[PDB]
Amino acid sequence: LYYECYSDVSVHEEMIADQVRTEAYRLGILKNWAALRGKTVLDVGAGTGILSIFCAQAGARRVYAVEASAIWQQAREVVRLNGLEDRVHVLPGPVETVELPERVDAIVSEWMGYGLLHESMLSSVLHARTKWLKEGGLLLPASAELFVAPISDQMLEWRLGFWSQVKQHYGVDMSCMESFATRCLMGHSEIVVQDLSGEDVLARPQRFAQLELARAGLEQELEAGVGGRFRCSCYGSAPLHGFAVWFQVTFPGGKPLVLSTSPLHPATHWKQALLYLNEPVPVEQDTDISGEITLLPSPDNPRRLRILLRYKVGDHEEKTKDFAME
Amino acid sequence: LYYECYSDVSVHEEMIADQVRTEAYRLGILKNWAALRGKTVLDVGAGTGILSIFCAQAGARRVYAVEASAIWQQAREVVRLNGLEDRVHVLPGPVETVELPERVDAIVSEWMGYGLLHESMLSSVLHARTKWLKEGGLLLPASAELFVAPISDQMLEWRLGFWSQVKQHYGVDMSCMESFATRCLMGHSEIVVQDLSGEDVLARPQRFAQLELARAGLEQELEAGVGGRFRCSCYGSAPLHGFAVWFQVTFPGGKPLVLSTSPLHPATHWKQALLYLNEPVPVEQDTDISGEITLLPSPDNPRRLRILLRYKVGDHEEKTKDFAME
Ligand SMILES: [Ca+2]
Ligand SMILES: [Ca+2]
Ligand SMILES: [Ca+2]
Ligand SMILES: [Ca+2]
Ligand SMILES: [Ca+2]
Ligand SMILES: [Ca+2]
Ligand SMILES: [Ca+2]
Ligand SMILES: [Ca+2]
Ligand SMILES: [Ca+2]
Ligand SMILES: [Ca+2]
Ligand SMILES: [Ca+2]
Ligand SMILES: [Ca+2]
């Protein structure tokens, strides 16, 4: 028989094979053994169930693993296989309307999407806190931070310069293709998910927001836009291609465990979210760059990430570019 | 301003950056300097124009570069840049209805698609031979050959076994996910384009068709199906995941130059076309495998590649699986 679960198997494979992600959660949960042991937990967007089993293994008394997608069935199978059907309970459907027998002492979730908030489960986590979390109850992870830096994307640089190098390899000039490749690769308003390294970072990264997940007003702030201003000074001479946005999340310490998606840190499946200018701009050591970044819901889909960028490079005029995920 | 030529720039970048491809054509054209010098050429599906300039550079008197996609405009720019607007002429639109001032002494084309015949220009090349090629005229490349071998795809092997290794890394058993991953990754009828190496080849590759491009009856054979039977004996003990199909093309010698897409040869953007069985089958040294492979047009689209596989492994019954490109 035939199945169309290829894409489905692929994404869960990707998340679990992300050892930075998955080991951070394993360790972050065990860090909170003292506050979990004998306690009840809700896992929002439980997927294949691995995080809920981790909670069990930190000594949680009972875990409710809620998952709306079709993978919920594999999660029940996995729970059973680990001898935990008595303690970890798999409930299909969205957390917004699932009905539990009791309020919980903790919520755990890997809710983060690309650019933190693309197709993320944050709204669901916050709905569940309000509805099902006891007072004094805990959230794992407990906070997030957002960062921006200017970039000189060395791979993009190579793709654009490609056409001018054709002469040197095949003896035909194609340098005229360069303006075209620039229009095609940068002349759009889509957020590009791509992994960079420090070789691409052109100024000290800046934190432009800090979100305490349990704080009053966050659901409203998500609606109106999460972001802030930033200022930085370039390291050296390079083509500025735009900006990169990434995040970290923090687990309580029970020294906090930080899971980072920075290009200066080990790679993760989240990579980074790249915001390209329409064409490269030359910068130099100490060229100043300021601006503002705002993460927003899209008009027809709150879970499709929009990013509004305002930026000023040196003594160029401030400009605006409004981006969205495909 | 914004543009949607990203995908467009990407594919041409890919072809030209394919040095095996592009250098094979450069050399194959120059091999035929004697038959080109002072002669007229038609380049079918000229793209960015690079192959037509190669023909000029082999001393062709005049080259007609015909291209139906939007890239034809960049080709005219590239020709001009190489000082060849007097000799190489860029004509938009499909070759089937383009009107040239004269018949030609040669047709050149990189017409091959994935699996040779997915979204290929072969039908167009054959139409142009009939309509515009002089008698005694030449085609570059002049022939193609198709090959099949059984494979043990080491990357697929790793993906399937992934779930049983989760215990060893995170201390949660997910071996039950394996049946699921198998359904999802192999339980479909899509041709998968993927690059392999000899570490994946499980028996001596077999040639199942040879196409002399200028031969009578080929347009008809393409309609009815190109293919043939094959027999082979496995090297050793491994999970059989299915079969790989690839091709080569040959340029006249003026020792023929062969451009190959075999996994035993240097990588090309064509990679190989993989035909997965619904699940892995154990084989051993000298396990015999026979069958038949046929490349066919799809019912609603002759340029969407269909492959009908009949195969028999050892003393298992012959089976059939009917594949197509997405
Ligand atoms: Ca996630
Ligand atoms: Ca999506
Ligand atoms: Ca990458
Ligand atoms: Ca700040
Ligand atoms: Ca703010
Ligand atoms: Ca300054
Ligand atoms: Ca091609
Ligand atoms: Ca297609
Ligand atoms: Ca590959
Ligand atoms: Ca044969
Ligand atoms: Ca045949
Ligand atoms: Ca035998």
From Swiss-Prot, chains A, B:
Residues involved in S-adenosyl-L-methionine binding: 12, 21, 45, 67, 96
N-terminal signal peptide: none
Effects seen without this gene: Embryonic fibroblasts from mutant mice display growth defects, premature senescence and increased levels of TP53 and multiple TP53 targets. In liver, knockdown disrupts the formation of a cAMP-mediated transcription complex involving CRTC2, reduces the expression of genes encoding gluconeogenic factors and decreases glucose output in primary hepatocytes, it also restores euglycemia in insulin-resistant mice.
Subcellular location, record wording: Nucleus
Main location group: nucleus
Pfam families listed in its UniProt record: Methyltransf_25, PRMT_C
Active site (catalytic residues): 110, 119
Gene Ontology biological-process entries: cellular senescence; DNA repair; methylation; negative regulation of DNA-templated transcription; negative regulation of transcription by RNA polymerase II; negative regulation of ubiquitin-dependent protein catabolic process; protein modification process; regulation of mitochondrion organization
A GO term from the CC aspect: nucleus
Subunit structure: Interacts with (and methylates) HIV-1 Tat, Rev and Nucleocapsid protein p7 (NC). Interacts with EPB41L3 and NCOA1.
Protein name (database record): Protein arginine N-methyltransferase 6
Species this protein is from: Mus musculus
Taxonomic classification: Eukaryota, Metazoa, Chordata, Craniata, Vertebrata
